[PDB]
């Protein structure tokens, strides 16, 4: 199931969807896995999140070349932390168009990240304004409210049972909400529930630091964010 490709791991989740996993030593936490997605949409590939580093992200592109062999049309990154945007330069070096929440691009320099080339904006109900996410194919981008960070966004894959919560969602057996340094403790619980409501059909919940889980990950995450209130 898990394909090891250099220092990264790739796992097929659906006929056109794979999870990419990369690792970074956090002095004091061990080697932390971070997950993103790779989606084939016809004759092109779409990426959700970089790896932690440029070198790892270039390796994602190398895996895509070997295992899919179609151009990567775009990447969308789900907030301005290293696990999700650390490899932006590698995407730009490869000529890939990049997208992030406008707020993520605003925060990127102070977070030590390189901004994406394009900014997503969101309607009052949280759905991306479609003019800012052109040619996204099956990717349905939703801002659930501030939680893990103020800029965190989420992505469902139309035609599959998969929704990606990024660092907002933890697995159903998780014991903590992880890094709350940039979190909105007041609104976290509501934002987690809004993600679940935006993607009611999704039975496979993919997230940044755990293997894919059932919808119990959403309910469990929300119950824990209640304790920050
Ligand atoms: C589990 O230990 C971690 C994992 C990730 C982080 C990150 C990246 P994120 O997961 O918050 O996006 C930022 C940080 O300051 O410490 C961390 C500690
Ligand atoms: Zn984060
Ligand atoms: Zn994280």
Swiss-Prot record:
<feature type="binding site">
    <location>
        <position position="179"/>
    </location>
    <ligand>
        <name>substrate</name>
    </ligand>
</feature>
<feature type="binding site">
    <location>
        <position position="209"/>
    </location>
    <ligand>
        <name>Zn(2+) 2</name>
    </ligand>
</feature>
<dbReference type="GO" id="GO:0008270">
    <property type="term" value="F:zinc ion binding"/>
</dbReference>
<comment type="similarity">
    <text>Belongs to the metallo-beta-lactamase superfamily. Class-B beta-lactamase family.</text>
</comment>
<dbReference type="GO" id="GO:0008800">
    <property type="term" value="F:beta-lactamase activity"/>
</dbReference>
<comment type="function">
    <text>Confers resistance to the different beta-lactams antibiotics (penicillin, cephalosporin and carbapenem) via the hydrolysis of the beta-lactam ring. Does not confer resistance to the polymixin colistin or the fluoroquinolone ciprofloxacin.</text>
</comment>
<feature type="binding site">
    <location>
        <position position="170"/>
    </location>
    <ligand>
        <name>substrate</name>
    </ligand>
</feature>
<keyword id="KW-0732">Signal</keyword>
<keyword id="KW-0574">Periplasm</keyword>
<keyword id="KW-0614">Plasmid</keyword>
<feature type="binding site">
    <location>
        <position position="79"/>
    </location>
    <ligand>
        <name>Zn(2+) 1</name>
    </ligand>
</feature>
<keyword id="KW-0862">Zinc</keyword>
<keyword id="KW-0479">Metal-binding</keyword>
<feature type="binding site">
    <location>
        <position position="83"/>
    </location>
    <ligand>
        <name>Zn(2+) 2</name>
    </ligand>
</feature>
<comment type="subunit">
    <text>Monomer.</text>
</comment>
<feature type="binding site">
    <location>
        <position position="167"/>
    </location>
    <ligand>
        <name>Zn(2+) 2</name>
    </ligand>
</feature>
<keyword id="KW-0046">Antibiotic resistance</keyword>
<dbReference type="GO" id="GO:0042597">
    <property type="term" value="C:periplasmic space"/>
</dbReference>
<dbReference type="GO" id="GO:0046677">
    <property type="term" value="P:response to antibiotic"/>
</dbReference>
<protein>
    <recommendedName>
        <fullName>Metallo-beta-lactamase type 2</fullName>
        <ecNumber>3.5.2.6</ecNumber>
    </recommendedName>
</protein>
<keyword id="KW-0378">Hydrolase</keyword>
<feature type="binding site">
    <location>
        <position position="81"/>
    </location>
    <ligand>
        <name>Zn(2+) 1</name>
    </ligand>
</feature>
<feature type="binding site">
    <location>
        <position position="148"/>
    </location>
    <ligand>
        <name>Zn(2+) 1</name>
    </ligand>
</feature>
<dbReference type="GO" id="GO:0017001">
    <property type="term" value="P:antibiotic catabolic process"/>
</dbReference>
């Amino acid at each position: 199931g898990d394909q090891r490709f250099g220092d990264l791991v790739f796992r097929q989740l659906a006929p056109n969807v794979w999870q990419h996993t990369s690792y970074l030593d956090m002095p004091g936490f061990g080697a932390v896995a971070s997950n993103g997605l790779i989606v084939r949409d016809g004759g092109r590939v779409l990426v959700v999140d970089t790896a932690w580093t440029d070198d790892q992200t270039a390796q994602i592109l190398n895996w895509i070349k070997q295992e899919i062999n179609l151009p990567v049309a775009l990447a969308v990154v789900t907030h301005a932390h290293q696990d999700k945007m650390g490899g932006m330069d590698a995407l730009h070096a490869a000529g890939i168009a990049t997208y992030a929440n406008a707020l993520s691009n605003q925060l990127a320099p102070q977070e030590g990240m390189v901004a994406a080339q394009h900014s997503l904006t969101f309607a009052a109900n949280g759905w991306v304004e479609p003019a800012t996410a052109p040619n996204f194919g099956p990717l349905k981008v939703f801002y659930p409210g501030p939680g893990h960070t103020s800029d965190n966004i989420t992505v469902g894959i139309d035609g599959t049972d998969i929704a990606f919560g990024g660092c907002l969602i933890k697995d159903s057996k998780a014991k903590s909400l992880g890094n709350l340094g940039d979190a909105d403790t007041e609104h976290y619980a509501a934002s987690a529930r809004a993600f679940g409501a935006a993607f009611p059909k999704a039975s496979m919940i993919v997230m940044s630091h755990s293997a894919p889980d059932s919808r119990a990950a959403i309910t469990h995450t929300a119950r824990m964010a209640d304790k920050l209130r």
